[PDB]
């Protein structure tokens, strides 16, 4: 197995994947990596597993109708691991914790978002639609681009937002467009 978590690029008390040479931090993995089950198999593992299962899984679909489906396990874990994702890049860092607004001629959002949060929501089994965990998810990026306005700091939310949308396209195999 890796000698780093597969999240956060670091050592430390490392969870490896036993179907896979990934390894993790026991809060870096979505869910947190569970107590017992030997053999354990990480969130790509269990994702592959799905598509293999049904090949059909990855022909084309429309947004729309993917925002409409309920939180049934498999999209539960598909949104869990599209969270994931989105963490694996350094700069979620930035919408990772609970943000506060004090910048001279702006005035912030009406409805604040984070990473952790989107988490927690996914953990209580908050959402019922996997439209609320996309909404939320772009709603971290559309409060930053509009608080930051002309600062060069906008940058961060188009960056992490391409990350979350290129994955979302993927795991949810929409179909491809010009
Ligand atoms: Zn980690
Ligand atoms: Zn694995
Ligand atoms: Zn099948």
Redesign the pocket.
């Known amino acids: 197995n890796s000698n780093i978590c597969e999240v956060c690029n670091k050592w430390g008390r490392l969870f490896c ?4 040479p ?1 390894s993790f931090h026991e809060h870096c993995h979505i869910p947190s990596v569970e107590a017992n089950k030997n053999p354990w ?2 969130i ?2 269990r994702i592959k597993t799905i598509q293999e299962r049904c090949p059909e899984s990855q022909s084309g679909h429309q947004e729309s109708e993917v925002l409409m489906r309920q939180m049934l396990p498999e999209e539960q874990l598909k949104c869990e691991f599209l969270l994931l994702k989105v963490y694996c890049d350094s700069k979620s860092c930035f919408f990772a914790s609970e943000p506060y607004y004090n910048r001279e001629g702006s005035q912030g959002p009406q409805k604040p978002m984070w990473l952790n949060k989107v988490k927690t929501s996914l953990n209580e089994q908050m959402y019922t639609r996997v439209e609320g965990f996309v909404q939320d998810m772009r709603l971290i990026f559309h409060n930053h681009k509009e608080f930051y306005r002309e600062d060069k700091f906008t940058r961060l939310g188009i960056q992490v937002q391409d990350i979350f949308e290129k994955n979302f396209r993927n795991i949810f195999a929409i179909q491809e467009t010009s």
Do not use: E, I, K, L
């Open positions: 994947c036993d179907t896979c990934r198999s990480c790509f593992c």
